[PDB]
Structure formats: structure tokens, C-alpha cells
Write a protein that binds this DNA or RNA. Structure first.
Length: 1017
DNA sequence: AGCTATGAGTGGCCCCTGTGGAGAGAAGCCTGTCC
DNA sequence: GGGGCCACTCATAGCT
RNA sequence: GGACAGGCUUCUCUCCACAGGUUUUAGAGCUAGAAAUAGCAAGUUAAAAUAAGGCUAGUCCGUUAUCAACUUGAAAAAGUGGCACCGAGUCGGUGCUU
């Protein structure tokens, strides 16, 4: 006999509750086989549980970092282009200059050439640094001086300008000397560059030099004043790097804001600090040259300085004169946003169409990359396909055909009432055409009043007309038709159906592109039909937005019997006058049959595909996938007999989950090709279950344990079955008080960044990771704290001691994400590289994160990483304590009748002895499985100290207390005024003799491996 | 004894950031018309 | 939020 | 229940750029003192890297999603675990089939 049963589900962002109920609301318990090498061959478990997993993440960070990588690569490419241009002449002046620049990061020992990068001799380096303290002095010198300068300094200036060329937020050419545009540019440049009194061709360099000079003067003044009045604080301000003083502001990591915050109170304590304080209020005291404000500098200033240098120094160096435009274009060029990556087919993010297989360089970008086709592909891929015809692209919203479709569809259901007419009548096709020609082609917006006054009253000679279905105006508007009539000024050209394709292409071109040059290029094909004025006016009009119906759907598909399209039927359909919905749903026409052919159901469709097609944050998609797998495994458990009812609650996403479950469950088709719905998919709202809990006193407290998800799923199923359909309440209370609930933490292999992104200074440690292959961390520093992908149990021998003696060992080794590929390629070589010898390959066990181990007395631990464990046991608290805690916590916030509130208050007051019982149970559970003796003693002392506090405060602080025994990583908590630090389990040796547990997604199937029998001494 | 080492434990600190431009879409609030 | 890392102090196992 | 149009908000995905931050090196520290150290001078900039690197050699790609165990599979993927009753502190006991 097949036992009828129903499955309840609770879907969240982090958990998926599942419960199996029979027709009598009982939860059956079955005896399951256990595999492995342990003696426990059979375990009895209840059919209720919850699944827990880490939340899914969005793709934002990956996109940001990928874009950053591309920017860095292209900047390096610009530098390489400049060096390639200069190489031939730099060979004659100083051959090894570029090698010195390239290897400057290395220490003195590892450098191949002389250590000084610029000149290679100390006297010239010192002279250069004295004459040009900052690069801006060199830039101004090269801008103004007419003397022949050393080519190396010219390269330094040009590279400095190219590498930091500035933003591109302003198009066109900008006048640095600043109609109303001149003033708008002048106030704009006022903040960018401040005060250029003496005439200088390069203003930015002059401003930076002014800032440096003011910095020097103010620093000298501050030193003098501090030394005169406050001798004791001189060392603190100018020597101590760990403070926020000037020493920390320059040689330390202190920011400008912190430096000002520290220095302001001291300045007020000294005399003669009026100017310094005024500057400090302006954020201009002792300011650096390289600050975060420079983000507002337009690239035109740098371009002007570059051009000035190239003009000044061209007479001495012939190669600069020939390559001036190349150097300028290196700075000015960027890849247009619609072009995308310049990938050669081998990138999934690419859409560029390349004309010739040459290498794309800034000097020949125009000749190689098809810009117009690239823009078309950029704007076409994102647009949604037509639902009725999945293989056809949708039309633009402002397309003429779309507007005609809307007008004819709206006029289809218009009813008019005249004198002598017993019933409202539909407008005929001739009437619709006449109305369109008279008003819709003459008025941008046509109102019901205008229609009645103009067409019925004047043409049809009807004095009184009543119209239904349209409210004071028609929504459809022929705005595009009016715009084209205004521009082209040819009514016959617009009214000719032979010109439909040309107008459609013109509208599509206007919608697709936003650069005027591309629009001009594509419209050039139709320049023979229009004059120059019409052509230029067309290039100015722009439309935005896309429609929902394709051209093939409206005017492309033709009925086999009649030959009319949907648009044609809307124009005239006889007495039927069927709208778009009726036309597509009419069985008498081939339209319905063609549409039914058009939809294709997924034949062997992958579930992940349809889930990815859904809309929403990826976390809910992960939850949906987990829910579906849970349902599949539950069906597998019950003998593959599909359940009668499925109740879910979480609303389009919920309906999508419902459709997925319906499609997977109900598949058999009857003799009439109709779906045989053996399984009913049910959607409920959590308000019903919440009211059910509040009415029948099934209170839940989320801070106690994780059983609440399973209880919510069980209540969902019970409520759904009861609604759609003493003993029942007793059964419910028995079920909700069960101690055994299957909680499973989904094991996941960690992925992501290799380690933390902060680069740390050099230090004698073996835990620093090199930034490059040849960069020893003891000399150059590097990254730290790699994230372990997964741990592997290793049984081998290690040479220990100074004598290098072989000792048999058994320990957990953590594989970092960086080494995952190398380890999976050949585990033996990787293990040998770490010093392990005589490795037994068959004993390598893959242990992902949150692997569950069992210990004595039922104590359980989950493997958080190679060196830290997490609590793995759930506290089973009797329901009466949960109810008392809920009632006491909301003691002053109960929402109900006064009699019920008084009854709850009395019940709280009478059972005050429950507090000591709760404390005792917490202590017993902690002593059994937590082993937090010091923290437990602190908790007990704090409870004893505050034993006279009001009941509500006691309950509120006790609710916080269950953080100690909660599943997962330990967390700190506050109990009254005393703070308890977290107890971390920083040793993994105890699990080397534990019983490893492998659990299926529901936890019903187990495979227990006892590691104590592996790798004995 | 006399000395060494080491691992084990405990307490505390640490974690890359700021912005601009272009486009495409759904989903949730309301109205109107329909199936 | 939670794992990694370091300074510090201690017991215990190891070697002489 | 779904579709179309109109008014508002939020979120999801892709591309182009910018400014910082961090790391090492270069910017001859001086004096007295064996040294510890004490005094004085100076401080604002620059080069390179910015996930190790990969082959498909591109001015491309590298942090999203997916993953209990055993057998078959490159992978996707497929296959593998008796029933009922009485009880309940992480599940136990009993009876039948086999």
C-alpha cells in the first residue's frame, strides 16, 4: 500500500526547511541503512529537518576587479608604446636607461646595472634632485625653457603625463585662458587650477609649485613657533611616526584629515597662529602635491602641456617632430564604451567585429574595427527577445509599425452610441481608416471630445455620440509620424506602404545609435531620397525605448486562409473586430497554431538554465535549486511515489518555483494531451502561519536554535492541507517537541581571492606569500593570510629534529586556493614538495569546509579550516521554556485582548522558577559539548549577581545567552553589563581520531568513516 | 637532577577606498484596456 | 563577521 | 492567472575611464662619542607591481554560478540504501519479509 503523504517547504536566503507529513499530520520515522566501517549499521530518524548554507554572492566585485585589470594592462601598453617610440634615440644617449627604470623595484644586490635609475652616477642624481625637487618643476622648465634639454628628462615628463593623463568627463576643446560658455568654463577652471598671476603656458605646474612653496614656508614657521613655545612636543610632532603628527603625516600612514585633527588644538595653544588656523579651516595647510583632489583635472591641461613641450623641444630632436601626432594620440585615445574589449574571439565578454586581422593600435583603430556594427551588436544583445516568437528581435517603441498596431488595436474595442441605436456598435475598418487619416495623422494626441466633434459630428452627421472604453483621450499616439511629417514634409512618402522598410530602418537607426557620426554614416544610404536639410534634421531626432512585439508577429506572419496579418486584421476584421489577444487566441485562424508552434518547451532542459533565466538576487536562485534537490531526494526516500500535496511559502519568484515544481512533478499527459496534475503545488502567505502560531501559543524564538525552520515548514504543510481539505492539537504539540531534527550544514569548497589585499612590510617570517615568482618575501614583503580551499588528511613520515629522523605522522594539511590546481594535477608531487615522505595515496580524503566529525559523548565539531573548529551541536529546549521566554520577552509588548494579556502575565509570574531551570540546562549542555569552563563560570557569576532584576530584563539577557550554544562560529555577546569574549577552538588534533560523517543533502543517508583505524602508529 | 623545545593556550588586533559616463532588463506601487 | 597572525605564558615531552 | 500602454521607486548584468592607498628602491644626513647614545639638519617627489600566472599569444583570460560518499564517466551526466508497530534528550526497542 502506498502511504499518502505531503511535503512542506520553507525557502529562504540561507535555509531551506523540509517536512514530510501524512494525512493525520504525523511525522513518520523510518530506519535507514548506514554505510562505512563503523558498527552502527542502522539509525532511526524523523522525516523532518532543515538545510543550512552560505549565502550566494553577486558578481559586482568580480566585474569591478576585471575592469581594473584591463585598465592596468592598457596603461602598461601606453607606457610601452612611448618607450618603443623613444628607443631608437635613447639607444645613442644611454643604452641601459630603460633597464634601470624597469628593474628599479629590486634591491641593490639583485640589480644588474648601476643602482641610480636616472643617470647611474650619484653626482648627477643629487644635482637633479636639488635642481628639480618635484616633477612639476621639470614640467614647467620644459614648458618654458627654449634650451636643448637632455632627452631623459623629456622622456620622464612625457611618461609622467601619459601615465596620469586625467579624466575625460568634458568633450571638445577647453580654453585654458578662461560667450556664456567662456564664463561657465572660467568658474569651472577656478577650482581645478588656483591663481595663475604671472604669465605661464602651463598653469597646473605653477599651481603645484605654489603649493610646494607655501608648504615649505608654513613648515618652517611651524617649526620655529613650536620650538620657541613648546619644546617638549617637538619630538612627538616631528619624530614619532606612530602618532598623527607631521612625522606620521609624511613618513607614516596618517591621512590629511587626521593630521589636521591632531594639529588644530595645538595651534590654538600657541600665539601667532592666525594665518595657520585660517589655512587649516580651508584645508590648505602643509598640503601635499599628490592628493585626492586632483580627480577634477581635465585631460586637456595635460594635453596642452604635452603639446607645449613637443613644440619647444622639436627643433633639436627631428624624431619628435615626425611623431608629435602619435604621442598626442597616445594620450587622447581611449576605447569607446560600445566597442568593448578588443578580443580575438577567445573571450566570452567580447562582441567586437574586426575587419582585418592586423594588430589593433591607437594609430590604426579606425581602419580595423567596424564601429557601426560594433555599436549594433552592443545594443542588440541586451534587448529582450519576443515572447510570442523567441527567435525574433523586438521592435523599437517609437517604430511607425508599432504605433499603427497600437492605434488599430485601441480602435478595435471602441464602441459608439448614436440616436436610434439599440446597442453600442464597433467602428468599421473604413471608419477606423478615416479616423486615423483625419485625426491621428493630424493630431499628436487625439481626445474623445475631438473625435466626437470632428468625425462623428462633422463627417458622419451625428449630433450626439457616446463612446465607451476610452477615457477622455486615446493612449496610442502617432508621435513618430508627426515628427517625420515635420522633418521630411512629404505626406505621400509617409503614407506609401512601399516605403515601409525605409522608414522602419530609419527609425531603427535613430534608436540604435547615439553618436551622430554613425547615424550620418548609415543614413547616407538614403541620402538620395532626401535633401540635405531633411537629412540633417533626421540626424538630430532621437528615440529611446523598445517595444514588446516583433515585426514578424504584427505584420510578418500571414494567415494561410486569408493572407492578412495581425495588423491587417486590426485594420479590418469584419463583424468579428478581434483585438490582438483575440487574434492570437483565435482557433479559426492559423495564428494560434503558428504561435503554439513558436513556443518551444525545454527538451531535456537543464534545471540550472531555467533557474538562471529567473529574475532576482542569486541567493534566492541558490535557495530554489537547493529546494528542488531536497524535493527530489525526499521523493527518492518515500519509494518514488510522488506526494499528493506540496506547500511552499517565501510574488513572481514564488510562482516560478511553483512552476518548476509542477513541471518536474506532473509530467504524464492524458489522451487529450492535457497535463495530468497528480501533484498540487500550493502557495501560502506567512501571515496565516504567524496567526496560527499566535492563536494556539506555538511561539518561536529565533535565538535558541535552528529547529524553527523545520517547525515553520511543518506548520506550512499542516495549514495548507487543513485549509484545502483535540487529536490534531495533541499531534502538533508532540511533533513540535521532538528533540531529533536533521540539521545539515552544506559542505562547500571555498573560492575567491587568494588572500588579503593589503601588502605587508618585510619581516622574517615564513607565512608571507611572494607577490612575484622572483620576489623573496623576506626582502620585498607580500600578501598574507591565504584562504584554504579544503583540507586533506595525510598519512606519511616527516623528517623532524636536527638529525632529520623519520617519524610517522597523521595530520590535516590545508590546500590554499592558489595551490589548488597544482595539487589536483598531481597530489603526490605536491605532498612531497612539503616534506612528507612515504605518502599513502589511498588515504587522501577530501575534507571540504564544514565537514562534520563525531566525538565522545555525542560531541560534534565542524571543520572550519585547517586549524580551527566550530560548534556542531544543537540545544534541544523543551517547548514550555520557549513559550515562557517568548511571553517574558514581549511582556510589555503583547498585542491582544486585555484578558489574554493578563492571563499571559499571570502565567509568566507563576512560573518564575523556570529561570533557574533554563540556567541549569544551559550549564549542563555547555559542560557536555561546549567546554567553555571560564566563560560558563563568568555566565553563572553574572546570573547570580543580577538575580533580583525584573523578569523582562532577565528574559532579554537570557535570550542573548544562547549565543554561546548556537551552531556555527563562536561569537561574543553582552549579558547585562559584563561582556564575554569568544571561545575559539584553535586545535584540530582531537578530530584525527574522530568518526567522519558524510551526509546527503537531507542528512538521511549517512556514510560514517572512523579515522582512528586509518594510519595507526 | 639540568636544560631545551614546542605546542597549546589566551588575549588582542587586523581586514583596499572614493567617483564619473553609457546601455539593457525585471520587480514592486497605481490607473486604463483586454484574454 | 570570522578566520589569520603575533606576543606571552605555561605544561609537558624530549634529550642529556 | 496572463498580456499591452501610461506615472513613480528599487534592484540585477555588461563596457569605458579617473583619483588615491600599499610595497621595494633612488633622493650622499651632519657633528661629538669605541658604542649605547645626545644635539642639529631634512621631510611634499619619482620608477615598477597591484590577485601567483595561463595558452588560445589576444592591447585576451584569472575572485559569479555549480560540488555528501561508492560504481560508470574528460565533463555534463547516469546508477546505488526493506516494511510495519510501540515509545523519546539528538534517537531506542520489537515483529515480519529477505
Amino acid at each position: 500500500m502506498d502511504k499518502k503523504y505531503s511535503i512542506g517547504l520553507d525557502i529562504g536566503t540561507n535555509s531551506v526547511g523540509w517536512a514530510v507529513i501524512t494525512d493525520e499530520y504525523k511525522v513518520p520515522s523510518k530506519k535507514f541503512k548506514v554505510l562505512g566501517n563503523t558498527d552502527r549499521h542502522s539509525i532511526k530518524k524523523n522525516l523532518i529537518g532543515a538545510l543550512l548554507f552560505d549565502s550566494g554572492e553577486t558578481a559586482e566585485a568580480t566585474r569591478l576587479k576585471r575592469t581594473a585589470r584591463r585598465r592596468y594592462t592598457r596603461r602598461k601598453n601606453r607606457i610601452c608604446y612611448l618607450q618603443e617610440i623613444f628607443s631608437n634615440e635613447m639607444a645613442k644617449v644611454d643604452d641601459s636607461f630603460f633597464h634601470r627604470l624597469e628593474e628599479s623595484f629590486l634591491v641593490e644586490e639583485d640589480k644588474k646595472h648601476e643602482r641610480h635609475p636616472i643617470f647611474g652616477n650619484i653626482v648627477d642624481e643629487v644635482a637633479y634632485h636639488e635642481k628639480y625637487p618635484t616633477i612639476y618643476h621639470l614640467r614647467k622648465k620644459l614648458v618654458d625653457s627654449t634650451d636643448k634639454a637632455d632627452l631623459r628628462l623629456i622622456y620622464l615628463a612625457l611618461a609622467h603625463m601619459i601615465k596620469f593623463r586625467g579624466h575625460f568627463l568634458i568633450e571638445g576643446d577647453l580654453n585654458p585662458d578662461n560667450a556664456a560658455k567662456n564664463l561657465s568654463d572660467a568658474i569651472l577652471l577656478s577650482d581645478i587650477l588656483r591663481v595663475n598671476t604671472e604669465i605661464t603656458k602651463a598653469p597646473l605646474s605653477a599651481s603645484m609649485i605654489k603649493r610646494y612653496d607655501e608648504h615649505h614656508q608654513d613648515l618652517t614657521l611651524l617649526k620655529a613657533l613650536v620650538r620657541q613655545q613648546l619644546p617638549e612636543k617637538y619630538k612627538e610632532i616631528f619624530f614619532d611616526q606612530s602618532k598623527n603628527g607631521y612625522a606620521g603625516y609624511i613618513d607614516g600612514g596618517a591621512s590629511q584629515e587626521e593630521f589636521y585633527k591632531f594639529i588644530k588644538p595645538i595651534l590654538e595653544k600657541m600665539d601667532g597662529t592666525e594665518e595657520l588656523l585660517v589655512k587649516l579651516n580651508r584645508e590648505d595647510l602643509l598640503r601635499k602635491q599628490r592628493t585626492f583632489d586632483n580627480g577634477s583635472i581635465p585631460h586637456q591641461i595635460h594635453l596642452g602641456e604635452l603639446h607645449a613641450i613637443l613644440r619647444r623641444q622639436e627643433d633639436f630632436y627631428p624624431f619628435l617632430k615626425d611623431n608629435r601626432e602619435k604621442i598626442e594620440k597616445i594620450l587622447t585615445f581611449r576605447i569607446p564604451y560600445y566597442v568593448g574589449p578588443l578580443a580575438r574571439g577567445n573571450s566570452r565578454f567580447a562582441w567586437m567585429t574586426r575587419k582585418s586581422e592586423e594588430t589593433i593600435t591607437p594609430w590604426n583603430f579606425e581602419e580595423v574595427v567596424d564601429k557601426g556594427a560594433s555599436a549594433q551588436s552592443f545594443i542588440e544583445r541586451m534587448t529582450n527577445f519576443d515572447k510570442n516568437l523567441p527567435n525574433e528581435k523586438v521592435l523599437p517603441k517609437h517604430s511607425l509599425l508599432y504605433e499603427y498596431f497600437t492605434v488599430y488595436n485601441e480602435l478595435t474595442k471602441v464602441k459608439y452610441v448614436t440616436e436610434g441605436m439599440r446597442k453600442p456598435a464597433f467602428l468599421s475598418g473604413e471608419q477606423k481608416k478615416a479616423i486615423v487619416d483625419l485625426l491621428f495623422k493630424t493630431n499628436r494626441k487625439v481626445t474623445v471630445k475631438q473625435l466626437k466633434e470632428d468625425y462623428f459630428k462633422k463627417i458622419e452627421c451625428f449630433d450626439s455620440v457616446e463612446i465607451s472604453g476610452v477615457e477622455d483621450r486615446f493612449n496610442a499616439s502617432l508621435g513618430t509620424y508627426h515628427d517625420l511629417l515635420k522633418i521630411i514634409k512629404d505626406k505621400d512618402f509617409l503614407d506609401n506602404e512601399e516605403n515601409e522598410d525605409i522608414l522602419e530602418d530609419i527609425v531603427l537607426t535613430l534608436t540604435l545609435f547615439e553618436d551622430r557620426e554613425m547615424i550620418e554614416e548609415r543614413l547616407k544610404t538614403y541620402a538620395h531620397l532626401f535633401d540635405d536639410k531633411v537629412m540633417k534634421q533626421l540626424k538630430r531626432r532621437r528615440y529611446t525605448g523598445w517595444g514588446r512585439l516583433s515585426r514578424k508577429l504584427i505584420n510578418g506572419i500571414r494567415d494561410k486562409q486569408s493572407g492578412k496579418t495581425i495588423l491587417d486584421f486590426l485594420k479590418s476584421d469584419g463583424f468579428a473586430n478581434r483585438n490582438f489577444m483575440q487574434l492570437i487566441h483565435d482557433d479559426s485562424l492559423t495564428f494560434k497554431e503558428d504561435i503554439q508552434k513558436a513556443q518551444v518547451s525545454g527538451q531535456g532542459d537543464s534545471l540550472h538554465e531555467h533557474i538562471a533565466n529567473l529574475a532576482g538576487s542569486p541567493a534566492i536562485k541558490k535557495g530554489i535549486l537547493q529546494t528542488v534537490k531536497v524535493v527530489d531526494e525526499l521523493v527518492k526516500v518515500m519509494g518514488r511515489h510522488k506526494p499528493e500535496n506540496i506547500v511552499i511559502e517565501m510574488r513572481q519568484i514564488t510562482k516560478h518555483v511553483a512552476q518548476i515544481l509542477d513541471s518536474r512533478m506532473n509530467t504524464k499527459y492524458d489522451e487529450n494531451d492535457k497535463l495530468i496534475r497528480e501533484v498540487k503545488v500550493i502557495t501560502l502567505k506567512s501571515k496565516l502561519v504567524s496567526d496560527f502560531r499566535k492563536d494556539f501559543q506555538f511561539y518561536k524564538v529565533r535565538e535558541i536554535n535552528n529547529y524553527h525552520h523545520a517547525h515553520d515548514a511543518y506548520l506550512n504543510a499542516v495549514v495548507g492541507t487543513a485549509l484545502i481539505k483535540g487529536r490534531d492539537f495533541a499531534t502538533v504539540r508532540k511533533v513540535l517537541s521532538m528533540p531529533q531534527v536533521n540539521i545539515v550544514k552544506k559542505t562547500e569548497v571555498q573560492t575567491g581571492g587568494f588572500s588579503k589585499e593589503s601588502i605587508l612590510p618585510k619581516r622574517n617570517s615564513d607565512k608571507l606569500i611572494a607577490r612575484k615568482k622572483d620576489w623573496d618575501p623576506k626582502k620585498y614583503g607580500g600578501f598574507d593570510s591565504p584562504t584554504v580551499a579544503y583540507s586533506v588528511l595525510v598519512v606519511a613520515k616527516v623528517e623532524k629534529g636536527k638529525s632529520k629522523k623519520l617519524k610517522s605522522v597523521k595530520e590535516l594539511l590545508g590546500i590554499t586556493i592558489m595551490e589548488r590546481s597544482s595539487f589536483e594535477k598531481n597530489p603526490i608531487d605536491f605532498l612531497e614538495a612539503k616534506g612528507y615522505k612515504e605518502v599513502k595515496k589511498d588515504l587522501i580524503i577530501k575534507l571540504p569546509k564544514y565537514s562534520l566529525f563525531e566525538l565522545e559523548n555525542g560531541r560534534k565539531r565542524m571543520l572550519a579550516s585547517a586549524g580551527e573548529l566550530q560548534k556542531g551541536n544543537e540545544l534541544a529546549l523543551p517547548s514550555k521554556y520557549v513559550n515562557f521566554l517568548y511571553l517574558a520577552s514581549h511582556y510589555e509588548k503583547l498585542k491582544g485582548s486585555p484578558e489574554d494579556n493578563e492571563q499571559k502575565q499571570l502565567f509568566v509570574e507563576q512560573h518564575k522558577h523556570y529561570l533557574d531551570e533554563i540556567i541549569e540546562q544551559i550549564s549542563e549542555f555547555s559542560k557536555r559539548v561546549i567546554l567553555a569552563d571560564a566563560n560558563l563560570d563568568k555566565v553563572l557569576s553574572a546570573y547570580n549577581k543580577h538575580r533580583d532584576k525584573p523578569i523582562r530584563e532577565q528574559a532579554e539577557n537570557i535570550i542573548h545567552l544562547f549565543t554561546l550554544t548556537n551552531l556555527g562560529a563562536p561569537a561574543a555577546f553582552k549579558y547585562f553589563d559584563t561582556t564575554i569574549d569568544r571561545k575559539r577552538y584553535t586545535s584540530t588534533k582531537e578530530v584525527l581520531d574522530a568518526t567522519l560523517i558524510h551526509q546527503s543533502i537531507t542528512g538521511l543517508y549517512e556514510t560514517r568513516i572512523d579515522l582512528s583505524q586509518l594510519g595507526g602508529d
